[PDB]
Ligand binder design. Structure first.
Ligand SMILES: NC(=O)c1ccc[n+]([C@@H]2O[C@H](COP(=O)([O-])OP(=O)(O)OC[C@H]3O[C@@H](n4cnc5c(N)ncnc54)[C@H](O)[C@@H]3O)[C@@H](O)[C@H]2O)c1
Ligand SMILES: *C(=O)[C@H](O)COP(=O)(O)O
Ligand SMILES: *C(=O)[C@H](O)COP(=O)(O)O
Ligand SMILES: *C(=O)[C@H](O)COP(=O)(O)O
Ligand SMILES: *C(=O)[C@H](O)COP(=O)(O)O
Lengths: 334, 335, 337, 333
């Protein structure tokens, strides 16, 4: 199985990818990173993290590398992926974390530079799009470029899968109350063409699109076209919650829904359950893609018509990263 | 000539804003007395200096037993029990009850025993007339003595639900409000009555919470009782909130039809605003509406003959709701 | 009679540039903004002008065309030039440029606006050793031959009036300042590279972040006698606007707190730039201030053992709008010289 | 003495328990006194917005908490004198309510049958301990002692190092300090202090600091020579103290840094950094104070010199580590 990884983009997701590989003592080794910033600044950002605290392992750097837990990781600085020297240290699978290569066509550049596979940390149009412990069995040995969808997709999918398997989802709409992220603005000022993205993120509730609305239908194809949604971005640094309002294929009670979800979470490393009265800071550093919260289930029933609201927490950074890593570990062995 | 002399019980966020709004609109209502647990010095400091709305627009001073606001005295009483408030001293006739401790007819009766004639409660207060101005204020009459203006979220939800119900019918619906933190919550993790989530640091968390709209809505629009449920997610913004409603309607619709219907309902409506601008919560701070419908967030999800309709309205849960309280107060005084 | 200059162009319609317009309209200035240069579309600029997270809705109407804003019914041209020398300032006869981008903070750089047809430039930031004005501290150093001028920084505009008053009353022998300062656009929203400065890379709304300010170092431009006598820095903190500067000085006289506060009170009298408070205010109370600086008598502290004395004085400032009111007073006088 | 009681299971009290378990202390917490139900206390112990999930099991009964399998009695007395500390034999009381910050007030716990009291705050004229500055002042006859305040625990090691190396002639400090429970969530009455009434997460708020009164008890040669205050700001925990001093010697920055570095060597209470840290990096710190050499500043004109030195502190967990050090020593005297 492939054991050598390269990371393109050592931002929030890239840095956490490394952290989680080390934490689970993966046999995968990160051999190289591509990013335009100096090793000294990357080392600083690896070592000190506003959301997750001090890095658990030693961190140092040289002019062209980081040294992490005594191991050397090359730092390349190519603006175009086609130029990254992935062959130099034998980088086989690229975790593409920049946001600038979110298509098969764009990520082909890494294969052209000598890698064997690419795992894209975002939705990436019409390609295999995997939420681990939902549809990771769709992968096979011939796949070369795959997506792990988005954080919100990894929250929504397991919950949608459980409801669909138990009851049928006829139609549904989701809203994620979502921690602010780097695509937003610190102060009011231009942020590309999206007006709301221009607004001070830590001072506002901000409506925003969600990657789940396009990606969910690739993950659970029976639900393609049956689900829409969006986000409200709010001033918490990480930790998010997805609410899904569905019409189901049969009549249910709150207990029945909660039981079905509890069953779906049993011995499921990707999908957790809680009936504790938690809040978002309790999900920070979670090792699930999604934690269903039985305390927030609500059934609104008027005869033949019933609306079912189900709610799951997710750490949009580290939780989603644990999912990426599960998918990567499987992807490497194919 | 109306029943113009008012007393405020509870000079907190809502009480102080009551005064600010009455003065802003040059109301004929005269606030003649306040009851609160704290000194006039402290109440004057809080009235003058506001973290959400800025400097008070009028002069503020105090004496040992009064505030002096724009040169007009307001008596300050410190009675923990409302039956002991001497409302007759200055002739306070209508009491704006803003403490949270008297949210029923039986409790707010104390003000009437203490010599007031009417009470308007700034919160849901059980099975009593419960008014969202410009939704059901025509249900008030001259015999009402204790009435509620529901909650902020009810004032946000009701006009949007009334419009949809009138134009399309609502068969069933569920709401979530993404809601600014309030004084019922906690600064640091620590006990906060019986509710476990209320104990958690409010400016550092998304905190699920119950909403007053969930019981108050079938009092305001009786055709909808039993048909809506909902809750809140309390989040770290200081004021400014947004209510999402997911409904099944009585007919099939397009987003444009929905937006047009809501736009028509907002026209010449001082309580209910409309936007198709890409606003965010800070833009609703200081709003003079109870609710502002946002056409940019309308979403129809349809499969077959099944349709879910998501409609969204903003509200300033402080000042916006207070403008509604004041409209209701002004009418109640004239009855 | 030679009329004062009345037509302004704004280079950079960021926070400062937008607030420049706001303040000119609020004061019903004689000065009209006739043009703006910025690379962002009029649609987005109109959206940002109309809706402000810090100051609320714009008080006048706003609309736009593909190449203009229409503000209070008046058209303002919008150009999109990357190089200042290419801005067509002569089209609407922009005479004074308010240079708000941060990319032209020197005489050499800002003279490009003169090449582009403007007559004078006022830079909204420190700009090396050029004429540098804190209004009501050293604006009487301006004259008719000044063509490119700086208004220093917000922190300079906070520190200087307090330092001037102390220097004039008592003497400042040496001093150091710390500003506990609202976060700004030069910082980061999430932890990530922000040029070469390590602390600027850290999430601004989630941290106390030490940061430079040249305010004290270059104070000799504004108060020559204090050149080289002051140092300081900032702690950037999670408030959206509103800041406070503390100055610890060795003075040239033994003083009491009352004596310090009285001298500062006299300095703030009939002074539209420098206010005084003895109220127990907090940062949100300074948001929207029309002063450059507001001295707070409640925070004065004298620590003294024998002849050894330290004096702490503290002034609030709205690092956005308050600083902008200073920029506008400077601009109005500059226009008449 | 090994059996402890906690009066007040707020931020400090819960973290006292957390740290005691973390260091595998032989101290045994046998009882807690707080007006809140065990249900709610167990929920707050389990789930912490600043430090994350509690690392041990937590359960409860109507009158107890069960922590890592061990029962801790929970009493609900509003007056300390009525707390029945003799029932489980609580000998040393960690007094964390803020309502008994004097000898005369904390005497109540001795009348209630405890042997000694350690107060988590300044408490007037009593022995006031910053661990690794003056913990050698404690002896076996002391019955009521203070661990000063978080800011004092930050300031003291920095002031002792400067004073020992250079002399501090006079100084003034400002701490840029995380908001705390004594402040207000929304603008509204908060006792008599006007600034405390203001929304803490939305403002810079000038405030007193415990270090102003306590530092002279910790370092007696400096009594009357230091003053200061706080600016409370919107971070949940993590703070930073700046001290501006007139020293008794002329110095360079490197000389100051070096002197500080030496003071932090083999010193479990006082850390050192030359990295470009920010406040979130101090959250969870196991020091009372971390001196930051990157912020050192020397301002000199002629033969006048001002020296600015800066130290980080986790005002919650760091200070609690110092409290625990002092408690462990106090229990053995
Ligand atoms: N977002 C909002 O704040 C909001 C919006 C709509 C309605 N409300 C509702 O209106 C009421 C007040 O809310 P608030 O946010 O102003 O609370 P607040 O806590 O800011 O104010 C409560 C005030 O009442 C005073 N008080 C408490 N008990 C009292 C008593 N027994 N006698 C006299 N004074 C007393 C307090 O000192 C404080 O000044 C509540 O019923 C609340 O549900 C609040
Ligand atoms: C998580 O991937 C990131 O915060 C994007 O959020 P989505 O809501 O999944 O688009
Ligand atoms: C408004 O009344 C106050 O914030 C309460 O909020 P609800 O969601 O209306 O209870
Ligand atoms: C104000 O100009 C801006 O926030 C910069 O702050 P300084 O502290 O003046 O550099
Ligand atoms: C720490 O003890 C608490 O936050 C008090 O702060 P001080 O600045 O030490 O009073």
């Amino acid at each position: 199985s492939m054991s050598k990884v390269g990371i393109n983009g050592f931002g929030r997701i890239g840095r956490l990818v490394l952290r989680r590989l080390l934490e689970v003592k993966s046999n995968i080794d990160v051999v190289a990173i591509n990013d335009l910033t100096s090793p000294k600044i990357l080392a600083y950002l690896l070592k000190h993290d506003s959301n997750y605290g001090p890095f658990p392992w030693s961190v140092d750097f040289t002019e062209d590398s980081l040294i992490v837990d005594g191991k050397s990781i090359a730092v390349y600085a190519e603006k175009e992926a086609k130029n990254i020297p992935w062959k130099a240290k034998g980088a086989e699978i690229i975790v593409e974390c920049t946001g600038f290569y979110t298509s098969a066509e764009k990520s082909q550049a890494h294969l052209d530079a000598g890698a064997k596979k690419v795992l894209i940390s975002a939705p990436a149009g019409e390609m295999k799009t995997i939420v681990y412990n939902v549809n990771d069995d769709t992968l096979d040995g011939n796949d070369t470029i795959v997506s792990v969808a988005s954080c919100t997709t990894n929250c929504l999918a397991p919950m949608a899968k459980a409801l669909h398997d138990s009851f049928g989802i006829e139609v549904g709409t989701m809203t994620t109350i979502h921690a602010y992220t780097g695509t937003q603005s610190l102060v009011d000022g231009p942020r590309g063409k999206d007006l709301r993205a221009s607004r001070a993120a830590a001072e506002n509730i901000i409506p925003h699109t969600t990657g789940a609305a396009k990606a969910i239908g690739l993950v659970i194809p029976e639900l393609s076209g049956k689900l829409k949604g969006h986000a409200q971005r709010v001033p918490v640094k990480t930790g998010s919650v997805t609410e899904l309002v569905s019409i189901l294929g049969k009549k249910v009670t709150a207990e029945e829904v909660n039981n079905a979800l509890k069953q779906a979470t049993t011995n499921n490393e990707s999908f957790g359950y809680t009936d504790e009265e938690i809040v978002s800071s309790d999900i920070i550093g979670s090792h699930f893609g999604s934690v269903f919260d039985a305390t927030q289930t609500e059934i609104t029933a008027v005869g033949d018509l019933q609306l079912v609201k189900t709610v799951a927490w997710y750490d949009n950074e580290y939780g989603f990263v644990t999912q990426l890593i599960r998918t990567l570990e499987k992807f490497a062995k194919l």
